[PDB]
């Protein structure tokens, strides 16, 4: 028996020595040395320092450049706001509580901080899905005589909020729960504990399927069709060197987008799966911290891939950073 448990938490450490305390009450320095709490804080520092400028700049630059506010960019903006939720509701809170060595906001602070942290990265996730669907629709022309416009772009945005609430909202109400995780400085969905009172198991399956497999399948199909449609067009177009270039950059970009999505949700998936089928086994605080390291840094690398590497956005950004000229 691997940890000690309480009404609102599970500490990944044995109380056989009597040292374990509520993560809502006193420091966890038995889970990990204090310098490791500092490092965690240092990491949270990095993600704010990078995550905020680059995500905020995105909103700002949209405000400054008229050519940027277009229906196809709506979801990219949504990604930026999602990342910001991750930055404030999650990264900073964690910076703060890490410096105490425990979650100082208590069980209700846990629910809130957990809800927003989850809402943020889930909006971001479904944003990546919706974007792909749209790009599939617009470039692959699967529907006849259909033109994508303002009213579709709204729904796409709205659809990511309904999906994200469909994930984040249930633990507030008794389907799973929010509890401190890892080093217990931050709160997340309990996918690792078989807490039957909240039905944690049926939720982790529903998470695994609806919020992971569906996204993975849609994103592969949509971008798959695209790298098809564009490779087809170039082969029928070879007299055009530009169409040749295009098919080459779109493919590279789809490889980056697809690998990036995996690097973000695969650890959380691989770990959730392994724990589910490994149930007698003991999982340490730092190990539970790993798939979280991965999913959180997306708040930086996502807008670099999806914003800074987007030609139009990057130009307006260089204009704005460069004091209006260039």
């Amino acid at each position: 028996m691997c940890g000690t448990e309480g009404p609102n938490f599970y500490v990944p450490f044995s109380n056989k020595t009597g040292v374990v305390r509520s993560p809502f009450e006193a420091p966890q320095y038995y889970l990990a040395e204090p310098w490791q709490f500092s490092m965690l804080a240092a990491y949270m520092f990095l993600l704010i320092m990078l995550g905020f400028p680059i995500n905020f700049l995105t909103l700002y630059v949209t405000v400054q450049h008229k050519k940027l506010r277009t229906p196809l960019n709506y979801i990219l903006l949504n990604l930026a706001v999602a990342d910001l939720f991750m930055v404030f509701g999650d990264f900073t809170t964690t910076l703060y509580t890490s410096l105490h060595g425990y979650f100082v906001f208590g069980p209700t602070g846990c629910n809130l901080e957990g809800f927003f942290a989850t809402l943020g990265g889930e909006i971001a996730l479904w944003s990546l899905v919706v974007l792909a669907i749209e790009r599939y629709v617009v470039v692959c022309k699967p529907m006849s005589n259909f033109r994508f416009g303002e009213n579709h772009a709204i729904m796409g945005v709205a659809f990511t909020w309904v999906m994200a609430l469909a994930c984040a909202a249930p633990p507030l109400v008794g389907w799973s729960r929010y509890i401190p995780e890892g080093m217990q400085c931050s709160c997340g969905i309990d996918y690792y504990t078989p807490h039957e009172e909240t039905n944690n198991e049926s939720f982790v399956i529903y998470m695994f399927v609806v919020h992971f497999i569906i996204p993975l399948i849609v994103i592969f199909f949509c971008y798959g069709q695209l790298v098809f449609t564009v490779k087809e067009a170039a082969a029928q177009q070879q007299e055009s060197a530009t169409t040749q270039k295009a098919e080459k950059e779109v493919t590279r970009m789809v490889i980056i987008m697809v690998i990036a999505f995996l690097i973000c949700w695969l650890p959380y998936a691989g770990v959730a799966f392994y724990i589910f089928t490994h149930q007698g086994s003991c999982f340490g605080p730092i190990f539970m911290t790993i798939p979280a390291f991965f999913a959180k840094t997306s708040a930086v690398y996502n807008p670099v891939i999806y914003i800074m590497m987007n030609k139009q956005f990057r130009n307006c950004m260089v204009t704005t950073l460069c004091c209006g000229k260039n």
């Binding site: 277009t70 196809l72 617009v138 564009v230 270039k245 295009a246 950059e249 779109v250 987007n310």
Partner: peptide, 11 residues
């Protein structure tokens, strides 16, 4: 397609 590729920020 290049026109729609441009719209999507892909090229």
């Amino acid at each position: 397609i290049l026109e729609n590729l441009k719209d999507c920020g892909l090229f």
